[PDB]
């Protein structure tokens, strides 16, 4: 019933590990379909070969800008941006997958994986999934980031797709 997608992560081309995500399509369906479809690449464009452009140790890893590769772009499967579906789920801990945005109703394709409990984000970013397998791969990724987000090595989504 709820889809599961994976990401095979790479640090400058060396394979690092697989993170897999359960998308809560039963509560945030339109948000979950957009991450699912961008992971499969079935609509022609997507995450494969994009990188995490902003990694802040102890906060979150952000990625998903496949058009401009630096947080200023990305687009959804419904157009460039769409509404905040709802705020049922909250940022309760590491592994929560939440939507990045540029204020309300500006969701595109950027997402962030929390590596800590970030309750201040509640009510401001839609949560739509959580890490299933691979959280120590997300944790190891932190080491390649910095206080301001700049990463030291290129961290890419080498491959991604749907598992179930």
């Amino acid at each position: 019933v709820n889809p599961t997608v994976f990401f095979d992560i790479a640090v400058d081309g060396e394979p690092l590990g697989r993170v897999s995500f359960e998308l809560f399509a039963d509560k945030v369906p339109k948000t979950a379909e957009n991450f699912r479809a961008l992971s499969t690449g079935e609509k022609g464009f997507g995450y494969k070969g994009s990188c995490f452009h902003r990694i802040i140790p102890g906060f979150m890893c952000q990625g998903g800008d496949f058009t401009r590769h630096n947080g200023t772009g990305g687009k959804s499967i419904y157009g460039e941006k769409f509404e905040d579906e709802n705020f049922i789920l909250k940022h309760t801990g590491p592994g929560i997958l939440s939507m990045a945005n540029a204020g309300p109703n500006t969701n595109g394709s950027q997402f962030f994986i929390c590596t800590a409990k970030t309750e201040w984000l509640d009510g401001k970013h839609v949560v739509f999934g959580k890490v299933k397998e691979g959280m120590n791969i997300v944790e190891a990724m932190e080491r390649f980031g910095s206080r301001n987000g700049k990463t030291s090595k290129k961290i890419t989504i080498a491959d991604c797709g749907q598992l179930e």
Partner: protein, 220 residues
């Protein structure tokens, strides 16, 4: 157009002459009216860009409309190439190179490459993108064919209310400026331009009146 098999996979299939004949006949007989876009979308479901270029080049006559459609497709392809630059260098073995705007149009690519794009893993919907572009072009064409503007509608002293509302909604569907603007128009302009007798019969029902009672008022 691609068609699924018994085991679920799909492979290219030659375009049926019946589809082309029906498309050309409906274009000739029904000219360029609002009801060509649904039939076009229904006729060419899953059609490759070559099949759409066939269905467009095969339309004899109305060459100005076809040139408008070609210009619209050209602008959409240019915008697609600007928003999605293609990478250079060697391409991965498990991935086929991504198409450009002129190749999304299907102008400079072979049919086998279209089939590989459409049956890739994950599949790339070039046919759906080019169909969306053609549908936008056809919307602009049916906008151009619109005979009269929406504001110039005024019912004659003898023209029945049925013909008036028919003409009104015809040019309204041919306008397609927006949805909420259309909703405001069907509230205001519909009752603003009635014949005085039936006009006051409609005003007797107030703005809360629906179309059914609006018509059966002036009926009989």
């Amino acid at each position: 157009p691609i068609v699924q098999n018994i085991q679920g996979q799909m492979v290219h299939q030659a375009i049926s002459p019946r589809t082309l004949n029906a498309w050309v006949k409906v274009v000739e007989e029904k000219a360029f009216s609002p009801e060509v876009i649904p039939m076009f979308s229904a006729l060419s479901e899953g059609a490759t860009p070559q099949d759409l270029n066939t269905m467009l080049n095969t339309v004899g006559g109305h060459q100005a409309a076809m040139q408008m459609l070609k210009e619209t497709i050209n602008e959409e392809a240019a915008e697609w190439d600007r928003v999605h630059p293609v990478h250079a260098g060697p391409i991965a073995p498990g991935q086929m190179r991504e198409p450009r705007g002129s190749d999304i149009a299907g102008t400079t690519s072979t049919l086998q490459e279209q089939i590989g794009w459409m049956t890739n893993n994950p599949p790339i919907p070039v046919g759906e993108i080019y169909k969306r572009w053609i549908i936008l072009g056809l919307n602009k064409i049916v906008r151009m064919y619109s005979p009269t503007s929406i504001l110039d509608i005024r019912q004659g002293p003898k023209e029945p209310f049925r013909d008036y509302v028919d003409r009104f909604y015809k040019t309204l569907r041919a306008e397609q400026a927006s949805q909420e603007v259309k909703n405001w128009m069907t509230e205001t302009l519909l009752v603003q331009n009635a014949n005085p007798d039936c006009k006051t019969i409609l005003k007797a029902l107030g703005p809360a009146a629906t179309l059914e009672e609006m018509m059966t008022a002036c009926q009989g």
